[PDB]
Structure formats: C-alpha cells, structure tokens
Amino acid sequence: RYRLGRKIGSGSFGDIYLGTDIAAGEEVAIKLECVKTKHPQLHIESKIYKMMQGGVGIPTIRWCGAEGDYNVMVMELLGPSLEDLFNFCSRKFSLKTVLLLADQMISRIEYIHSKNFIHRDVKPDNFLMGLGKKGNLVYIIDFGLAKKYRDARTHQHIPYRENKNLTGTARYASINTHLGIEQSRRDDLESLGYVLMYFNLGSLPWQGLKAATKRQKYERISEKKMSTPIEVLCKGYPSEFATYLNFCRSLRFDDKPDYSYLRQLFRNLFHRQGFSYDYVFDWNML
Numbered sequence: 572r573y574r575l576g577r578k579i580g581s582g583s584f585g586d587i588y589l590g591t592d593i594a595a596g597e598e599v600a601i602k603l604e605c606v607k608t609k610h611p612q613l614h615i616e617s618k619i620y621k622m623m624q625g626g627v628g629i630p631t632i633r634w635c636g637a638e639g640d641y642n643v644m645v646m647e648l649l650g651p652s653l654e655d656l657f658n659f660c661s662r663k664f665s666l667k668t669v670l671l672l673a674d675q676m677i678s679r680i681e682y683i684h685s686k687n688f689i690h691r692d693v694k695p696d697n698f699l700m701g702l703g704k705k706g707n708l709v710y711i712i713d714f715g716l717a718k719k720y721r722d723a724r725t726h727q728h729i730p731y732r733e734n735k736n737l738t739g740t741a742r743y744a745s746i747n748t749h750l751g752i753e754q755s756r757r758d759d760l761e762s763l764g765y766v767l768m769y770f771n772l773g774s775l776p777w778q779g780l781k782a783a784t785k786r787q788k789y790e791r792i793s794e795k796k797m798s799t800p801i802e803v804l805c806k807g808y809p810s811e812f813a814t815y816l817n818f819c820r821s822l823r824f825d826d827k828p829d830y831s832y833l834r835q836l837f838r839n840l841f842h843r844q845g846f847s848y849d850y851v852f853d854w855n856m857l
C-alpha cells in the first residue's frame with residue numbers, strides 16, 4: 572500500500588524515508604525498524620503517537636507493522652524543521668519569531684504532559700512546520716525517548732531516581748539530566764529555555780568543546796553549563812529569558828509547572844515592542 576522513496580535521515584531508533592501512499596495518491600514519511608532488532612520500539616512509539624492524536628501540532632500516523640524484514644510506521648508529510656529554517660535564516664531569529672515560537676512550544680509541551688508523558692528530547696530538529704495552509708503551525712515529532720511520568724488514572728508521579736543515563740541531546744539537556752536525575756516535566760521546559768536562547772544567540776557557550784571520548788564531551792558540556800550563570804548566558808537579551816530559565820531551575824522533581832505564567836512572561840514582552848501583529852515568521856520574509 573506504500574512505495575518506499577529516498578532516505579532522508581534517521582530518528583531516535585529507526586530510519587526515515589519519503590514514500591508514496593498509492594491508495595491515497597499522497598506523499599508520506601515512513602519510519603522503518605529492523606524486525607530482527609535487539610530492542611524493538613517502533614510499536615511502542617506508535618502507541619504514544621496514538622495517545623496524542625488530535626492535539627494541536629501532533630502528527631497523524633499509521634502503524635502498519637511488519638512488511639518483509641521491517642516494522643513500518645507511516646506519518647503525514649510535514650515541512651522543514653526549526654533547525655533547517657534557522658540555518659535558512661543564517662542562524663539568527665528576530666525577537667518576534669522567537670516569541671511566537673515560544674508561545675507555540677510551551678503549549679505543545681504542556682499538551683504532551685497533560686497526556687501523562689515527558690518528551691525528553693526537546694531540540695530544534697524535533698519541531699517541524701506544517702505544509703500549505705498549516706505552514707504557520709509548529710508540530711513536535713519523535714516520541715522514541717518519551718516516558719510516562721504519572722499514572723493515567725491516579726496521576727501518581729513516578730518515583731525519584733538517580734544515576735540515569737543521558738537520553739537525548741547533550742546540548743539542550745537540563746542540568747539535572749546531566750547529573751543523572753530522572754527526568755520530569757521541569758526538564759522538558761528547561762531544554763526549551765536553552766533552545767530559545769540558542770535561537771537568540773546562534774550558538775550556546777557549551778557548543779564546540781573538544782574531547783576524546785563521548786563521555787568526556789558530555790562531562791565538559793555539563794561542567795560548562797553548570798559554571799555559566801543564567802544571567803551571563805542571557806546577557807544582552809530581555810530579562811524574560813533569564814526569568815524563564817530560573818523558574819525552570821527552581822521547580823522540584825514532581826512540581827507541575829505554571830505554564831501560563833511562562834507564556835504570560837513572553838506575551839507581555841511581546842506586547843511591549845510595537846510589532847505589527849501579522850503572524851509572519853522570519854523565513855517567510857525573505
């Protein structure tokens with residue numbers, strides 16, 4: 572029911588291709604997993620997507636299961652990632668674009684959390700713009716590293732644990748993630764904070780650290796991140812970004828974040844600039 576096209580990259584635990592849904596006469600994206608793999612995960616991830624279905628900015632998928640030597644998941648085709656568009660904009664976003672993105676991304680993460688999961692890999696590569704009439708909508712992708720943090724019925728939080736391996740990207744990981752603490756809601760939001768300052772700066776001060784082993788690289792990133800005060804990181808930019816990061820760093824393991832407070836930070840800032848309020852991102856202005 573699908574024709575496989577060219578390879579376009581890799582997800583957390585599989586390979587990504589373009590394809591043709593011949594029944595629908597539509598192009599789709601296809602994720603493949605070797606059926607004879609040590610730790611199968613595509614089916615689990617598909618179940619997570621299905622629990623998220625219908626939410627704003629949640630892609631629609633179809634778990635087709637096993638064809639030949641591969642488990643197959645099919646997703647509606649989406650547009651470029653925020654990293655692609657960041658490079659298209661020469662690696663700098665205007666304050667307007669950063670704040671519009673911030674408002675969408677805080678709420679996207681809140682939705683995931685409302686469905687009892689934490690994402691644990693918040694980074695620009697995992698946010699894709701929609702196509703056509705939804706070209707202004709930011710979608711989130713990739714639940715291969717997501718984890719349930721509370722019981723669906725009782726809302727009982729999972730237990731506090733330590734000595735956990737880093738799951739996700741080192742550049743945007745929270746400080747407590749580097750220290751091996753079990754991730755929770757606070758960590759997704761802290762990662763988002765680093766993503767936003769990354770959009771503001773073009774790079775983070777813990778980028779481009781040289782090391783031999785990967786472990787050494789991650790340790791150097793961790794140390795630089797813990798030795799860079801938030802006020803230094805955010806120097807020369809509106810205080811709201813530092814307030815955001817400090818607020819995230821003050822949350823306890825099982826605290827429910829005040830998402831509306833953070834959105835309101837950035838919205839008040841947004842409303843003091845004298846922008847035109849047409850909803851246009853930087854990449855659609857050049």
Ligand SMILES: COc1ccc(OC)c(-c2cc(C(=O)Nc3cc(-c4[nH]c(SC)nc4-c4ccc(F)cc4)ccn3)n(C)c2)c1
Binds near residue numbers: 582589600648650713
């Ligand atoms: C027509 O609009 C544009 C404009 C520019 C573009 O590239 C700069 C593109 C464009 C967009 C893609 C693309 O890959 N779209 C896409 C990717 C995924 C995707 N990306 C990743 S990580 C690199 N995993 C998945 C994926 C996840 C689950 C699944 F079942 C299938 C794919 C999902 C849906 N659409 N490609 C190859 C080109 C489209």
